Symmetry: C3
Subunit: 130 residues, 3 copies
């Protein structure tokens, strides 16, 4: 029986845009959403998945998922999508990573006031301890 | 040892298009494909993943994955992709959700006679009990 | 506690382009990267995920993930993405498959000298025994 956390947006805060996250599914207690980041309390291997739904015209959009721990900062994975010059695209990515207690997980979109959907069905972030 | 179900198309039936599903991998017995829906017999937390391969010209395409249970209907997640005006795009999404026995899982594409691939390598639906 | 393998590029080798893979996370011992393929030593059910980050102009890009075992060759899944005529797109796909010891897993891009990113955050391949 695995520990899990599935998070959806509460609001979008504006080089960078981030998402304030709220839990809608939680089992176990080794992970905690604290506003726009997720704290890791339990060292382990986790499946981490991220989707962002973008509405921006023209430019390449994508999210970057990173870990910052005892002294260093590391990108884990990124999703990238070209947008039509006209409108709509979800960007999903996921992978398996060793996370260390004390780690902070960030999901950042490297554009100002990025037009991201608040919809829980389109933009979400989650974890499964493996 | 986890219960799992991986499903692929048998045919595509035409506001809405759906897929008739057939199992190609099954372990355990808490899930059942019944034509264009999947019944959940066992309450639990599941990773649910969905890919659809689209061939439509011009318009935004995407699939919507939902649960209908004791009295209510809920979208779980959606995938969205703009299509070139020219041709080809897979749309993958997945997440972790608490499903209740008696639940019906639907995968719907909100366009008439949507040009979806029957290929099992391009359009598929699956579950892993966590 | 699941066996896992997360692999990233070392270099890209040129009808076909493949990736030479190196492990960055490994638990258990039922899987082995050997250059551009992955050998399966342990029969089981695995979540297999693949992302490729493409930089090619114009044409439809995508990767194909296959298994070759005792006498037969089988596509497992593929990801497909149209590219702008202008630039950038990640293609992620994943699914659950029964793999047999002795199996060889391949990730192929069906274009010559495909412009793929070596970045470990953009192009990766992984496995979780279920």
């Amino acid at each position: 029986k695995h520990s899990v956390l599935h998070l959806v947006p509460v609001n979008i805060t504006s080089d960078v845009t981030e998402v304030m996250w709220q839990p809608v599914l939680r089992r176990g207690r080794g992970l905690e959403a604290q506003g726009d980041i997720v704290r890791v309390w339990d060292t382990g291997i986790y499946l981490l998945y991220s989707q962002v739904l973008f509405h921006d015209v023209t430019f390449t959009m994508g999210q970057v998922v990173s870990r910052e721990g005892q002294g260093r900062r590391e990108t884990l994975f990124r999703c990238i999508r070209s947008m039509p010059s006209d409108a709509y695209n979800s960007c999903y990515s996921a992978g398996v990573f060793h996370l260390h207690q004390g780690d902070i997980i960030t999901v950042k979109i490297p554009r100002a006031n990025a037009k991201l959907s608040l919809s829980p069905h389109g933009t979400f972030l989650g974890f499964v301890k493996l």
